[PDB]
């Protein structure tokens, strides 16, 4: 008992009589329904004068602490561990949820406590890292004492020998293990440096040059007893340092591993209140005011169920005061909605990419669901390429459960929603193959034998064919390989393209009548549809009836001349004096009535609508564009033919010189050569053919629907329907 | 009606404001009356002390 | 903290909001118990200290660090004595004992980091190794506080 994709759903503007006290629960649940928007209210004042500023700022601050958790966690060797559970509940959960409440303030305090504690912990950890790095070189030690990179010791010795013009004692020793120097920021090799001098100024110069050479120094003891005592004190402090670093590392890793389990769910939980308060921001809940009053967009067929859910929550929340809602006088234009399922959501979205529907008009998505795949297929043709792309579509259709919860990225991207679009255009490609009779380029011959070329043939004679019958399903396989095949097929599919295009125009234009009739407007009907329809039929549909009559009569047996393939109308453009080769008795004569009707219709179309300042100026442009679009689009329908023939010829040429040379027949070397040739052929066909040409035809039919069909009836642009809800925020926004 | 609902909400808000104003006025009047009563009781206590002094 | 959170709320009642503000002001005025170094001294006289704002007296008022240092680390010796009495009697799982030990450890960490010269007094008292042993305390809060105190002491002594 709900609406469908037939048109825009029945909109509604209901009035939210939200009690002030229960407002947070009401907003939370109402957003949980994933069913309501909120009309933009009290937006006339700047964004930093809202009543919600303090909760917004504290929750955004909280999201910042959560991001800091995620950043340090990614720095550490640990990841999330509870992503699957949280997303499923919040995605399409029922009316029952565990709302937070004061646990929001609990979360805020918890996050602040966690930052103070782990900031202290990180300061302790890097301070003690500096401490152990300092002592590690000091412990390795045991005049001049110091350590420096082992590779630069030679230059240090040279600069020592040169800085003082004489000589000085020197000693060095390589270190056992590299030291992760803070200045170097890497575990570079090091070596001890020892020198000696007499003067104190020489010692100071040694200090200065060692500091310039990034060589740290230590206060060693010349006396053996003093050095031993210093080493003992260093070890005594260092043992406590190892113990404390081990303990603090254990505590940090334990608490991070514990917090990682809930952090992923905590983020998607806390993301709710940001939206909640941004939404109730529009409600205008003044502090002095009580019984909050607000409005939002709902589907009319869901008012009863949303009221029932709100009452159930109020009973669950214990709020004694009842909740009420009333529908306003919807003077303002409500948004357009389409309760599309996964079967047709892709088609609807692709259709509305051009423009959102009018408030209640006949949404163009529904006819496109089928026309777009078939318009593509009549452009695409081949069995084999369509079949491989249908397999590719199945790759996403069958694994829809898995792919839905895995990042689209650049592997699929917009194809994430294209699983069902590609499937339907693929099955229509199957049909077009049955009716063009070409698995890839090569024609198949299951059906009954067509043209019977004469049974006696010379070695290289030119042989015509006999119309012994009509091939039942599709183009006759006998046409393959013949010198007239291109002409026959091209004439055929020109006429097919123009006929199908005219049928598409008629079906799309009838939608304008349906839309106006649903809106119960008559002047627009009589001023646009009937004149426009009679014009478009009286020229182009008259051409269509011309061509169908032209096939219908067996011309040569009929005896009277057969007009050219696409001749009669352009011959008629001259004058009512039909030149020659009449289609039927008075068929080329009576059509002057249609022509005069159209030419006397054009000024009526020009004047009827304005006759209720710039309305006439708009309507004259409207008539001009109507006629020009009509002619241009009816011509544009040749694009189906164009890419059908392009695909057929490309398939032919690739097949003739990328596969099946049959070289080295019955030879193992020939087997290898044909294996490589087939691999290259399949790679070329897949990549080039399906990707390039299939998406090309996709785009051509897509534009076809966007203008040729849509613009005939779809004019109104309305507001989109974006209700208040979201599934999860596990995308790790930064 | 929508206008009727808005008018009803406005009337409810006005009634709530009137109740709050009546509460504030009652608070002020009670404070003044209790101050007067305390003054009277203190005058009675002073008169009792004066009577005790006269008896003494 | 609950009063502060209520102050952060936006209850739609002028009387209720005024009452919340008055309660918050009263709590803030009562928070003078922290600034009273006499209150900290009294808690020291008590065998068990409580996690009161006095436990943040040093951080909120570093002035008491001088009094703690005075009389040759008198307050530091008193705190070390309290910790040694708690440890030597064990009972680290006792809730009251655990709270007292945690408060003493936090205060000692605040004091020692406020004056590194007290590290020598702590070491002479045996508290330098006592806190290290206490780092393996059963209680998570006790162990964490001991780790913080040891990191403060080790970090200050490393200079």
PDB file of N, CA and C in Angstrom, chain A residues 20 54 58 105 109 117 124 128 131 240-241 243-244 247 251 286-287 289, chain C residues 1 5 8-10 12-13 135 144-145 147-148 150-151 154-155 158-159:
ATOM      1  N   UNK A  20       9.499  20.010  24.004  1.00  0.00           N
ATOM      2  CA  UNK A  20      10.846  20.546  24.176  1.00  0.00           C
ATOM      3  C   UNK A  20      11.752  19.563  24.906  1.00  0.00           C
ATOM      4  N   UNK A  54      26.925  25.587  21.178  1.00  0.00           N
ATOM      5  CA  UNK A  54      27.792  24.961  22.173  1.00  0.00           C
ATOM      6  C   UNK A  54      27.831  23.443  22.015  1.00  0.00           C
ATOM      7  N   UNK A  58      31.201  21.304  21.000  1.00  0.00           N
ATOM      8  CA  UNK A  58      31.741  20.232  21.832  1.00  0.00           C
ATOM      9  C   UNK A  58      31.762  18.909  21.074  1.00  0.00           C
ATOM     10  N   UNK A 105      27.307  12.938  27.252  1.00  0.00           N
ATOM     11  CA  UNK A 105      28.217  13.642  28.148  1.00  0.00           C
ATOM     12  C   UNK A 105      29.257  12.689  28.718  1.00  0.00           C
ATOM     13  N   UNK A 109      33.305  13.339  28.386  1.00  0.00           N
ATOM     14  CA  UNK A 109      34.248  13.284  29.498  1.00  0.00           C
ATOM     15  C   UNK A 109      35.266  12.171  29.295  1.00  0.00           C
ATOM     16  N   UNK A 117      45.251  11.573  29.530  1.00  0.00           N
ATOM     17  CA  UNK A 117      46.066  10.435  29.938  1.00  0.00           C
ATOM     18  C   UNK A 117      47.070  10.043  28.860  1.00  0.00           C
ATOM     19  N   UNK A 124      55.665  10.989  28.250  1.00  0.00           N
ATOM     20  CA  UNK A 124      56.550  10.101  28.992  1.00  0.00           C
ATOM     21  C   UNK A 124      57.345   9.204  28.052  1.00  0.00           C
ATOM     22  N   UNK A 128      61.381   9.432  27.676  1.00  0.00           N
ATOM     23  CA  UNK A 128      62.246   8.326  28.062  1.00  0.00           C
ATOM     24  C   UNK A 128      62.957   7.729  26.858  1.00  0.00           C
ATOM     25  N   UNK A 131      65.839   9.787  26.726  1.00  0.00           N
ATOM     26  CA  UNK A 131      66.719   9.393  27.824  1.00  0.00           C
ATOM     27  C   UNK A 131      67.540   8.156  27.472  1.00  0.00           C
ATOM     28  N   UNK A 240      66.261   0.787  36.071  1.00  0.00           N
ATOM     29  CA  UNK A 240      64.947   1.360  36.325  1.00  0.00           C
ATOM     30  C   UNK A 240      64.354   1.927  35.046  1.00  0.00           C
ATOM     31  N   UNK A 241      65.199   2.479  34.173  1.00  0.00           N
ATOM     32  CA  UNK A 241      64.689   3.005  32.910  1.00  0.00           C
ATOM     33  C   UNK A 241      64.128   1.901  32.016  1.00  0.00           C
ATOM     34  N   UNK A 243      62.928  -0.961  33.078  1.00  0.00           N
ATOM     35  CA  UNK A 243      61.709  -1.434  33.722  1.00  0.00           C
ATOM     36  C   UNK A 243      60.542  -0.491  33.446  1.00  0.00           C
ATOM     37  N   UNK A 244      60.773   0.818  33.579  1.00  0.00           N
ATOM     38  CA  UNK A 244      59.687   1.777  33.411  1.00  0.00           C
ATOM     39  C   UNK A 244      59.255   1.854  31.951  1.00  0.00           C
ATOM     40  N   UNK A 247      57.150  -1.231  31.263  1.00  0.00           N
ATOM     41  CA  UNK A 247      55.829  -1.114  31.873  1.00  0.00           C
ATOM     42  C   UNK A 247      54.948  -0.140  31.100  1.00  0.00           C
ATOM     43  N   UNK A 251      51.472  -0.895  29.112  1.00  0.00           N
ATOM     44  CA  UNK A 251      50.217  -0.211  29.410  1.00  0.00           C
ATOM     45  C   UNK A 251      49.643   0.451  28.164  1.00  0.00           C
ATOM     46  N   UNK A 286      13.741  27.781  20.818  1.00  0.00           N
ATOM     47  CA  UNK A 286      14.193  28.839  21.708  1.00  0.00           C
ATOM     48  C   UNK A 286      14.209  28.346  23.149  1.00  0.00           C
ATOM     49  N   UNK A 287      15.193  28.829  23.913  1.00  0.00           N
ATOM     50  CA  UNK A 287      15.326  28.403  25.303  1.00  0.00           C
ATOM     51  C   UNK A 287      14.096  28.784  26.118  1.00  0.00           C
ATOM     52  N   UNK A 289      11.133  29.402  24.824  1.00  0.00           N
ATOM     53  CA  UNK A 289       9.997  28.708  24.236  1.00  0.00           C
ATOM     54  C   UNK A 289       9.979  27.241  24.652  1.00  0.00           C
TER      55      UNK A 289
ATOM     56  N   UNK C   1      32.162  17.111  38.513  1.00  0.00           N
ATOM     57  CA  UNK C   1      32.039  16.920  37.058  1.00  0.00           C
ATOM     58  C   UNK C   1      30.598  16.840  36.588  1.00  0.00           C
ATOM     59  N   UNK C   5      28.847  19.245  33.874  1.00  0.00           N
ATOM     60  CA  UNK C   5      28.110  18.743  32.719  1.00  0.00           C
ATOM     61  C   UNK C   5      26.707  19.332  32.664  1.00  0.00           C
ATOM     62  N   UNK C   8      26.864  22.608  31.319  1.00  0.00           N
ATOM     63  CA  UNK C   8      26.994  22.555  29.870  1.00  0.00           C
ATOM     64  C   UNK C   8      25.670  22.287  29.166  1.00  0.00           C
ATOM     65  N   UNK C   9      24.645  21.835  29.886  1.00  0.00           N
ATOM     66  CA  UNK C   9      23.359  21.540  29.277  1.00  0.00           C
ATOM     67  C   UNK C   9      22.608  22.833  28.968  1.00  0.00           C
ATOM     68  N   UNK C  10      21.459  22.692  28.310  1.00  0.00           N
ATOM     69  CA  UNK C  10      20.632  23.815  27.880  1.00  0.00           C
ATOM     70  C   UNK C  10      19.179  23.584  28.270  1.00  0.00           C
ATOM     71  N   UNK C  12      15.526  24.015  29.294  1.00  0.00           N
ATOM     72  CA  UNK C  12      14.623  25.111  28.932  1.00  0.00           C
ATOM     73  C   UNK C  12      13.750  25.485  30.130  1.00  0.00           C
ATOM     74  N   UNK C  13      14.403  26.068  31.132  1.00  0.00           N
ATOM     75  CA  UNK C  13      13.707  26.555  32.321  1.00  0.00           C
ATOM     76  C   UNK C  13      14.605  27.565  33.013  1.00  0.00           C
ATOM     77  N   UNK C 135      54.917  -0.791  40.760  1.00  0.00           N
ATOM     78  CA  UNK C 135      54.511  -0.751  39.361  1.00  0.00           C
ATOM     79  C   UNK C 135      53.793  -2.025  38.941  1.00  0.00           C
ATOM     80  N   UNK C 144      48.750   1.984  36.936  1.00  0.00           N
ATOM     81  CA  UNK C 144      48.905   3.122  36.038  1.00  0.00           C
ATOM     82  C   UNK C 144      49.465   4.338  36.769  1.00  0.00           C
ATOM     83  N   UNK C 145      48.959   4.615  37.973  1.00  0.00           N
ATOM     84  CA  UNK C 145      49.479   5.732  38.753  1.00  0.00           C
ATOM     85  C   UNK C 145      50.938   5.508  39.121  1.00  0.00           C
ATOM     86  N   UNK C 147      53.090   3.733  37.409  1.00  0.00           N
ATOM     87  CA  UNK C 147      53.865   3.923  36.188  1.00  0.00           C
ATOM     88  C   UNK C 147      54.082   5.402  35.906  1.00  0.00           C
ATOM     89  N   UNK C 148      53.036   6.214  36.071  1.00  0.00           N
ATOM     90  CA  UNK C 148      53.184   7.652  35.867  1.00  0.00           C
ATOM     91  C   UNK C 148      54.188   8.244  36.848  1.00  0.00           C
ATOM     92  N   UNK C 150      56.666   6.699  38.462  1.00  0.00           N
ATOM     93  CA  UNK C 150      58.013   6.231  38.160  1.00  0.00           C
ATOM     94  C   UNK C 150      58.575   6.935  36.934  1.00  0.00           C
ATOM     95  N   UNK C 151      57.746   7.131  35.905  1.00  0.00           N
ATOM     96  CA  UNK C 151      58.196   7.847  34.719  1.00  0.00           C
ATOM     97  C   UNK C 151      58.572   9.281  35.059  1.00  0.00           C
ATOM     98  N   UNK C 154      61.913   8.816  37.135  1.00  0.00           N
ATOM     99  CA  UNK C 154      63.001   8.399  36.256  1.00  0.00           C
ATOM    100  C   UNK C 154      63.324   9.498  35.253  1.00  0.00           C
ATOM    101  N   UNK C 155      62.293  10.142  34.705  1.00  0.00           N
ATOM    102  CA  UNK C 155      62.525  11.221  33.760  1.00  0.00           C
ATOM    103  C   UNK C 155      63.219  12.414  34.390  1.00  0.00           C
ATOM    104  N   UNK C 158      66.894  11.420  35.262  1.00  0.00           N
ATOM    105  CA  UNK C 158      67.749  11.188  34.105  1.00  0.00           C
ATOM    106  C   UNK C 158      68.509  12.438  33.680  1.00  0.00           C
ATOM    107  N   UNK C 159      68.031  13.620  34.056  1.00  0.00           N
ATOM    108  CA  UNK C 159      68.696  14.865  33.693  1.00  0.00           C
ATOM    109  C   UNK C 159      70.007  15.032  34.455  1.00  0.00           C
TER     110      UNK C 159
END
